[PDB]
Design a protein around this motif. Structure first.
Motif, PDB file in Angstrom:
ATOM      1  N   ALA A  34      50.938  47.253  37.777  1.00 41.31           N
ATOM      2  CA  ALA A  34      50.055  46.974  36.653  1.00 41.31           C
ATOM      3  C   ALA A  34      49.351  48.267  36.333  1.00 41.31           C
ATOM      4  N   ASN A  35      48.838  48.350  35.116  1.00 47.17           N
ATOM      5  CA  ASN A  35      48.044  49.490  34.691  1.00 47.17           C
ATOM      6  C   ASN A  35      47.294  49.182  33.423  1.00 47.17           C
ATOM      7  N   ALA A  36      46.146  49.823  33.254  1.00 45.22           N
ATOM      8  CA  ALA A  36      45.278  49.587  32.100  1.00 45.22           C
ATOM      9  C   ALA A  36      44.318  50.768  31.998  1.00 45.22           C
ATOM     10  N   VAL A  54      40.362  49.668  32.314  1.00 44.72           N
ATOM     11  CA  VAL A  54      40.057  48.600  33.260  1.00 44.72           C
ATOM     12  C   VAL A  54      38.570  48.593  33.647  1.00 44.72           C
ATOM     13  N   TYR A  84      46.880  37.632  39.154  1.00 47.39           N
ATOM     14  CA  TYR A  84      45.568  37.393  39.731  1.00 47.39           C
ATOM     15  C   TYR A  84      44.868  36.298  38.912  1.00 47.39           C
ATOM     16  N   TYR A 121      36.961  42.591  36.152  1.00 47.57           N
ATOM     17  CA  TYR A 121      38.407  42.713  35.938  1.00 47.57           C
ATOM     18  C   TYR A 121      38.620  42.967  34.452  1.00 47.57           C
ATOM     19  N   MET A 138      42.999  43.509  31.498  1.00 47.71           N
ATOM     20  CA  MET A 138      43.809  43.081  32.654  1.00 47.71           C
ATOM     21  C   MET A 138      43.854  41.544  32.798  1.00 47.71           C
ATOM     22  N   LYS A 174      47.382  39.388  32.649  1.00 49.68           N
ATOM     23  CA  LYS A 174      47.790  38.467  33.699  1.00 49.68           C
ATOM     24  C   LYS A 174      48.013  37.073  33.086  1.00 49.68           C
ATOM     25  N   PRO A 203      42.498  39.106  47.194  1.00 46.84           N
ATOM     26  CA  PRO A 203      42.176  40.539  47.183  1.00 46.84           C
ATOM     27  C   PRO A 203      42.722  41.353  48.367  1.00 46.84           C
ATOM     28  N   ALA A 215      45.163  50.914  43.835  1.00 47.28           N
ATOM     29  CA  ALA A 215      44.782  50.461  42.489  1.00 47.28           C
ATOM     30  C   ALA A 215      43.469  49.668  42.489  1.00 47.28           C
ATOM     31  N   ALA A 216      43.280  48.805  43.492  1.00 48.20           N
ATOM     32  CA  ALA A 216      42.067  48.010  43.618  1.00 48.20           C
ATOM     33  C   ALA A 216      40.790  48.882  43.730  1.00 48.20           C
ATOM     34  N   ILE A 260      39.338  50.403  40.508  1.00 52.22           N
ATOM     35  CA  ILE A 260      38.574  49.521  39.612  1.00 52.22           C
ATOM     36  C   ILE A 260      37.070  49.793  39.754  1.00 52.22           C
ATOM     37  N   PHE A 308      33.877  46.824  43.362  1.00 53.52           N
ATOM     38  CA  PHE A 308      34.568  45.597  42.965  1.00 53.52           C
ATOM     39  C   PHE A 308      35.407  44.972  44.108  1.00 53.52           C
ATOM     40  N   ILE A 309      36.329  45.734  44.690  1.00 54.79           N
ATOM     41  CA  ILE A 309      37.274  45.155  45.692  1.00 54.79           C
ATOM     42  C   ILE A 309      36.565  44.782  46.981  1.00 54.79           C
ATOM     43  N   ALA A 325      35.000  41.419  46.348  1.00 56.36           N
ATOM     44  CA  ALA A 325      36.052  40.389  46.274  1.00 56.36           C
ATOM     45  C   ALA A 325      36.496  39.990  47.680  1.00 56.36           C
TER      46      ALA A 325
HETATM   47  O1  LIG Z   1      40.959  41.993  43.526  1.00 58.45           O
HETATM   48  C1  LIG Z   1      41.779  41.697  42.682  1.00 58.45           C
HETATM   49  C2  LIG Z   1      42.762  42.692  42.182  1.00 58.45           C
HETATM   50  C3  LIG Z   1      42.784  44.004  42.685  1.00 58.45           C
HETATM   51  C4  LIG Z   1      43.733  44.908  42.184  1.00 58.45           C
HETATM   52  C5  LIG Z   1      44.625  44.503  41.185  1.00 58.45           C
HETATM   53  O2  LIG Z   1      45.562  45.385  40.694  1.00 58.45           O
HETATM   54  C6  LIG Z   1      45.325  46.157  39.606  1.00 58.45           C
HETATM   55  C7  LIG Z   1      44.178  45.942  38.853  1.00 58.45           C
HETATM   56  C8  LIG Z   1      43.951  46.757  37.762  1.00 58.45           C
HETATM   57  C9  LIG Z   1      44.897  47.738  37.442  1.00 58.45           C
HETATM   58 CL1  LIG Z   1      44.587  48.762  36.030  1.00 58.45          CL
HETATM   59  C10 LIG Z   1      46.062  47.957  38.178  1.00 58.45           C
HETATM   60  C11 LIG Z   1      46.255  47.137  39.276  1.00 58.45           C
HETATM   61 CL2  LIG Z   1      47.729  47.339  40.266  1.00 58.45          CL
HETATM   62  C12 LIG Z   1      44.585  43.199  40.683  1.00 58.45           C
HETATM   63  O3  LIG Z   1      45.449  42.821  39.696  1.00 58.45           O
HETATM   64  C13 LIG Z   1      43.653  42.294  41.184  1.00 58.45           C
END
Ligand SMILES: O=Cc1ccc(Oc2ccc(Cl)cc2Cl)c(O)c1
Ligand SMILES: NC(=O)c1ccc[n+]([C@@H]2O[C@H](COP(=O)([O-])OP(=O)(O)OC[C@H]3O[C@@H](n4cnc5c(N)ncnc54)[C@H](O)[C@@H]3O)[C@@H](O)[C@H]2O)c1
Ligand SMILES: NC(=O)c1ccc[n+]([C@@H]2O[C@H](COP(=O)([O-])OP(=O)(O)OC[C@H]3O[C@@H](n4cnc5c(N)ncnc54)[C@H](O)[C@@H]3O)[C@@H](O)[C@H]2O)c1
Ligand SMILES: NC(=O)c1ccc[n+]([C@@H]2O[C@H](COP(=O)([O-])OP(=O)(O)OC[C@H]3O[C@@H](n4cnc5c(N)ncnc54)[C@H](O)[C@@H]3O)[C@@H](O)[C@H]2O)c1
Ligand SMILES: NC(=O)c1ccc[n+]([C@@H]2O[C@H](COP(=O)([O-])OP(=O)(O)OC[C@H]3O[C@@H](n4cnc5c(N)ncnc54)[C@H](O)[C@@H]3O)[C@@H](O)[C@H]2O)c1
Ligand SMILES: O=Cc1ccc(Oc2ccc(Cl)cc2Cl)c(O)c1
Ligand SMILES: O=Cc1ccc(Oc2ccc(Cl)cc2Cl)c(O)c1
Ligand SMILES: O=Cc1ccc(Oc2ccc(Cl)cc2Cl)c(O)c1
Lengths: 287, 287, 287, 287
Positions: free
Chosen positions: C122-124, C127, C172, C182, C186, C190, C219, C224-225, C228, C231-232, C235
Motif C-alpha cells: 500500500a502507499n499514499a 497518509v 485494515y 489512518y 487510505m 481499503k 496492528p 510502513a506503520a 504513519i 499511531f502504531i 494501535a
Molecule cells: O495499524 C494499522 C495499519 C498499519 C500499517 C498499514 O499499512 C500502511 C498504511 C499506510 C500506508 Cl501509506 C502504507 C501502508 Cl503498507 C495499514 O494498512 C494499517
C-alpha cells in the motif's frame, strides 16, 4: 386525518416510548399506551396526580393527546397463555384483557383500525449475568419477552391495521458488537429482533404492503437501563465523549426518527436497522 | 426562516436531484442548482422555454420555486486546478466561478451561509467495462468524480454552512454486493463514498457539529442510468418483482428521505448509509 | 509438486509479506519476491551480507528458501505506462521488467505458471493528513497504488496462473469503522479494495475458477506503520489491552491464515474479508 | 500429539458433521460423536453393519479413527432437566448420561481433557411455517435447540478443555438476508448464534484463552435440509448456477475450513462468521 399509534412499552416519562409519543403528538397522531401490568396502577396514579403534566407539553400551543392507556403484557399471546401465579398476582388480579390478542381486539373494538405500531419494550430475567453464565430459562425469557413479542404483536395487530401501515421497534448495537455488561441473552434477543425485522418486512410487505423497521438507539438513562450492571452512566459518558456528535442524546431525538419511519414520508424504507446514536456506532478506536 | 440547500448534480428532471429538489421545495427550503457545464446551456434553455413547468408542479396548488442555477464542475477544486484546455473549451469558455471553491464563495457572497448540501452526481469514463478490464485512468476517473468530489465539496462548503447543518450523497448497493454491469470502478467509488461518509462524519461532527449521511437508492430510469446500457430496465424489473414492497420506486421517494436527513428531525443520525430501495437489499434468494 | 507464490510487497523482514513468506516456505511453497525499486538494492545487499539469515530460520532444523527476487512497481501496468522521468531515475535506471505485465511475463518465462499470488503493499502520499484535508492528487495516489494495483495484478497474472489458483491481499478495519490517524485516503482505498475483492471474486471465479480474498490484519510494527507517525504504538497497545485474545499479534499469525487461503483447503471460500486481529473487530465498548 | 474433538450433531454420513469428522481425521485428530438419542440406535446399527465403511475412507493409507460415539441431546443441560415424557420414550429409556453436562463429565472421565469442540446441530419444531405464523413455543424451541445449546455446550465443556482450545458451530446466511422457506424461527436462531459467537469469543478469549468461530455454510442435501419447505433442491441448483465458483459444494469443503479454525494455525481468529459457500453470499443480482 385519522392516524392512530399503539405504543407498547411505556412505564413512565423517562424512556424512549414517551419520547416517541411526544414527537408523534406533534404530528397530531392519536396515541394509545400499552402499559406492563406490574406498573399500570402506579402509572395511572402518577398520571391522575399530574406528575407527567410538564412532560406532556409539546409547545406554546400543544399538549400531548393521549387517546387511551391499557394494560399490556407481551409475555402472553392469548387469554389461555396466562399461568395461575400471574392471574393470582395482586397487580394482575384487578386487570383484564391485557394479552397481545386481547389488546388488539380491544383497540379495534373501541377505535377501529390503526396505522402505526411501536414496540418499545424488552425484558430479561438474567440481564445481570454474563451470557456464558445465563441459564436456559433466563436466555429463553430474554428472547420471549424482547424478540418473539415483536412477531406476536405483528401477527395479532396486522388484522387491525390499514394497508400502508408502519411498525417500528428499538434495538441496541450490542447485537452486532460486544458490550460487556449487556447480559442475560439481551444481546442475543436484539440480534434476533434485527433479523426478524428483515424477515417480517418481506412477509408484511408482500402480503399487506406494511412496512417494519428498527431503530438502534444510543444510551438513555431510562428505568430499564438502570437495571444493567452505573453501566448506563458509563455508556452515556462514553457516548458523549467519543461519538462524532458531542451533544446529549434525548428520547425525542429517537422520537423524531420514529415519527418519520411511521409516516408515509418513508414509504420506500423497510426491513432496516436505522442508527440513532450520534454516530457512535461508526467509530473503531477512541481518539 | 432561511433553509437553503445547494444541490450538486441536476441536469434534467428525470434523476434523483430533481426528486430531492421537489420534496425540499415542498417544505419551503430554498434550492440552488449546481449544473455541470456540458449540460448547463441546454438545461437553462429548456427551463426558460417552460419545458420543466409541468415537472415543477407539486400539487397543482403549489409549484417548485428555485432560488438560483449555477454552472458547477465537481472535477475542479479551485480555479488553479482548471487545465488551459477545459478553460477554453466551447462549453466552458462562456462560464465562470464553476469550481468547488468558486461556487461556495459565490453562493456565500450572494445568499450568506447555507444549511443543507446534496451531492447527487457520479461519473466514470469506463462504466461499460467490467472492473477486471477497467484501466488505471478509468478507475481513477470514477474515484475522482464520484467519491473525491464529496470530500472536496465538504472541505469548501463547511466554511459557508451554519453549525447543525446536514450533508447527504447518493450511493448504490453494488458497493457491498456484486452487481454485474456496474463497471468502470463505479462499485469501488461507491464503496469509497460510503467509507468516506463515516470518516467525514467524525471530522465534521467533532469540528463543526455538521452531519453527513448517504442514501443507497434503488433503481431509477435517469439519464445516467440509461447510459450504462438494458442494465437499468433489468434492475427496475427485478426490483419491482422481488422487493418486499412491489411498487414503482419514485425519485420523490428518495426526495422525502433526503428532506428528513437534511432537516433537524434527524439530528442524532450521522455517518450512516440509509437504504431507500423498497427493501430489496434485505433479500438473499428470489421467489 | 510445484506450488509457486509471487509476493508483491516485501522490503525487509518486519512486515506481513515476510511473515507470509515464512509460513508458506514451511509448507514447501516456492516463493518469489516482488521488491519496490526504491528499496530493492538495499534489500539485496542486506540479503547477500546475510543480514536476514536469522530471520529466515523456521525452526532451526528448517530455514526459508526463496526462489527469486525481482524488482517490481505496482504503479505501472505495462512498459508503456512508465514516464521518461521514472525510467531514467537513479534507482530505476539500472532495473528492467518491473511493471506488472513485465514481471508476470518474466515469471512465466522462467518458471511457467504459478498458483498463488499475494498483494501485500500500500502507499499514499498524504497518509499523514486527515481525509478532509487530503488533496485530490493525494487521494487518487492512495487509490492508485493501494487498490487499483490489485485489479491490475489480477488482470496480468490470471494469464500465468493455473485454474483453482488463489489470490490474497491485506486490508485494515479503518475501511468499515473510523480510525483517526489512518489518513490520506487510505481508509477509502481499503474500502475500495474490500469491495473490489468481491467483484473480482465474481469475474475470476466464473471465468477462470480462481479465488480471491482479503485478510483484515490487526496492528504490526512494520516499516510502513512507523511512517504513519505514535499511531502504531497506540494501535498495538490498545489491541493487546482490549482484544478478546490478549497476546502479541505476529506477522506469522497472518502468514498461517494466508497460507490456508492460498491452499486448496479453502477451495469454497472466495470474495471474503477475513479478520486476523485477535478478535478486536468484534468489540464495541472497551473495559 | 493428543488432539481430541467432540462433534455434537452427527446422525448419518450425509451432513456437515461427518465431513468435519473426515477432515479432522486426516490431521490424526481423535473423534468423539454426540448423537441425538432418537437416532442413536439406528446409527449404531448402520455402523455395525458396515453401512458407513466406504464413507470412512480418507485415502490409500487412512481410515477415519472414531474414538467413541455417545448419545447426546442438546435440549437438556443436566439430568434434572429431562421431562417425564422423554425419559419414558422408547428410544431414550435404554440410554443414559446424554444431557450436556453428563456428556462433558463422561468424556472427561474416559479420555481426559479435549481441545476441539464442534456444534453441528439445529432443530425447530415449526420450521415449515413462516416466521409470522410461528408460535411462541415453536420460536423458543428453535432458539433453545439451535442457539442456547451452543452457550450450554461452552459452559459445560470449557471445564474439560485445554487452554488455547477452539470451538466452532455452523450457521446460514438467512440470519442476515431473507430466505423465504427458512421458517420456524431458524433465521432468528442463526442470527442469535452469530451474535453469541462474538460475545462468547470475548468471555472465552479473556478468561480461558479459548477461541470460538462460526462457519456460514452453503446448501448441502443433508437429512435436516430435506425437512425444509425441494427447498434444498432449489437452493443447491441456485448456488451451483449463480455462485462465483460453479462447483458442487461438499461436506468436506466445510470440513477443511473447520479443521483449520480448530487448529493452532488460526490462533489470531476469533468471534468471526466465516463464509464457506462458493462465494454466493457476495452476489446481489443474479446475472
Ligand atoms: O495499524 C494499522 C495499519 C498499519 C500499517 C498499514 O499499512 C500502511 C498504511 C499506510 C500506508 Cl501509506 C502504507 C501502508 Cl503498507 C495499514 O494498512 C494499517
Ligand atoms: N435506554 C437505552 O439506553 C436503550 C438503548 C438502545 C435500545 N433501547 C431499547 O428501547 C426500548 C425501551 O426501553 P427504555 O430504554 O425506554 O426503558 P423503559 O423502562 O423506559 O422501557 C421499557 C418498558 O418495557 C416494559 N416491559 C418490560 N417487560 C414487559 C412485558 N413482558 N410486557 C410488556 N411490557 C414490558 C416496561 O414496563 C418498561 O416500561 C427497549 O426495547 C430497549 O431495549 C434502550
Ligand atoms: N439512477 C439510479 O438508478 C441510481 C441508483 C442508486 C444511486 N444513484 C446515485 O444517484 C446519483 C444521481 O444519479 P441519477 O440516477 O440521478 O442520474 P442523473 O443523470 O440524474 O445525475 C447525474 C448528474 O450528475 C452530474 N455530473 C456528472 N459529472 C459531474 C461533475 N464532474 N461535476 C458536476 N456534476 C456532474 C450530471 O450533469 C448529471 O446531471 C448518482 O450519484 C448515482 O450514483 C442512482
Ligand atoms: N502493518 C500493519 O499494522 C497493517 C495492519 C493492517 C493491514 N496492513 C496491510 O498489510 C500490507 C503490508 O503492509 P506492512 O504493514 O507489511 O508494511 P510493509 O512496509 O512491510 O509493506 C509495504 C511494502 O509495500 C511495498 N510497496 C509500496 N508501494 C509499492 C509499489 N507502488 N509497488 C510495489 N511495492 C510497493 C513497499 O516496498 C513495502 O515493502 C499493506 O497493504 C497494509 O495495508 C498492515
Ligand atoms: N445442510 C445445509 O444446507 C446447511 C447450510 C448451512 C448451515 N447448516 C447447518 O449445519 C448444521 C448441521 O446440519 P446438517 O445440514 O449437517 O444436517 P444433519 O441432519 O446432517 O445435522 C443435524 C443434526 O443435528 C441433530 N439434532 C437435532 N436436534 C438435536 C438435539 N436436540 N440435540 C442434539 N442433536 C440434535 C440431528 O440428529 C442431526 O443429525 C446445522 O446447524 C445447520 O443449521 C446446514
Ligand atoms: O445502554 C444501552 C441500553 C440500555 C437499556 C436498554 O434496555 C433494556 C436493557 C435490558 C433489559 Cl432487561 C430491558 C431493557 Cl428495556 C437497552 O436495550 C440498551
Ligand atoms: O441502477 C442502479 C444505478 C443507476 C444509475 C447510477 O448512476 C450512475 C451510474 C454510473 C455513472 Cl458513470 C453515473 C451515474 Cl449518475 C447508479 O449509481 C446506480
Ligand atoms: O439450505 C440451507 C440450510 C439447510 C439445512 C439447514 O439445517 C437445518 C435447517 C432446519 C432445521 Cl429445523 C434443522 C437444520 Cl440442521 C440449514 O441451517 C440451512
Amino acid at each position: 386525518n385519522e392516524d392512530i399509534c399503539f405504543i407498547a412499552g411505556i412505564g413512565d416519562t423517562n424512556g424512549y416510548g414517551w419520547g416517541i409519543a411526544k414527537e408523534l403528538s406533534k404530528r397530531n397522531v392519536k396515541i394509545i399506551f400499552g402499559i406492563w401490568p406490574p406498573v399500570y396502577n402506579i402509572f395511572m396514579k402518577n398520571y391522575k396526580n399530574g406528575k407527567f403534566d410538564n412532560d406532556m407539553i409539546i409547545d406554546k400551543d400543544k399538549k400531548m393527546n393521549i387517546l387511551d392507556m391499557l394494560p399490556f403484557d407481551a409475555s402472553f399471546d392469548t387469554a389461555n397463555d396466562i399461568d395461575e401465579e400471574t392471574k393470582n398476582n395482586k397487580r394482575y388480579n384487578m386487570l383484564q384483557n391485557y394479552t397481545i390478542e386481547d389488546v388488539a381486539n380491544l383497540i379495534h373494538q373501541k377505535y377501529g383500525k390503526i396505522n402505526m405500531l411501536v414496540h418499545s419494550l424488552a425484558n430479561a430475567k438474567e440481564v445481570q449475568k454474563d451470557l456464558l453464565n445465563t441459564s436456559r430459562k433466563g436466555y429463553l425469557d430474554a428472547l420471549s419477552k424482547s424478540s418473539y413479542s415483536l412477531i406476536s404483536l405483528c401477527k395479532y395487530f396486522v388484522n387491525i391495521m390499514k394497508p400502508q401501515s408502519s411498525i417500528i421497534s428499538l434495538t441496541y448495537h450490542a447485537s452486532q458488537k460486544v458490550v460487556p455488561g449487556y447480559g442475560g441473552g439481551m444481546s442475543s434477543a436484539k440480534a434476533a429482533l434485527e433479523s426478524d425485522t428483515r424477515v417480517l418486512a418481506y412477509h408484511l410487505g408482500r402480503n399487506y404492503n406494511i412496512r417494519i423497521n428498527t431503530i438502534s438507539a444510543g444510551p438513555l438513562k431510562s428505568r430499564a437501563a438502570t437495571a444493567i450492571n452505573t453501566f448506563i452512566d458509563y455508556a452515556i459518558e462514553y457516548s458523549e465523549k467519543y461519538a462524532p456528535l458531542r451533544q446529549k442524546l434525548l428520547s425525542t431525538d429517537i422520537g423524531s426518527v420514529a415519527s418519520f419511519l411511521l409516516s408515509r414520508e418513508s414509504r420506500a424504507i423497510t426491513g432496516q436497522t436505522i442508527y440513532v446514536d450520534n454516530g457512535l456506532n461508526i467509530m473503531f478506536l477512541p481518539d
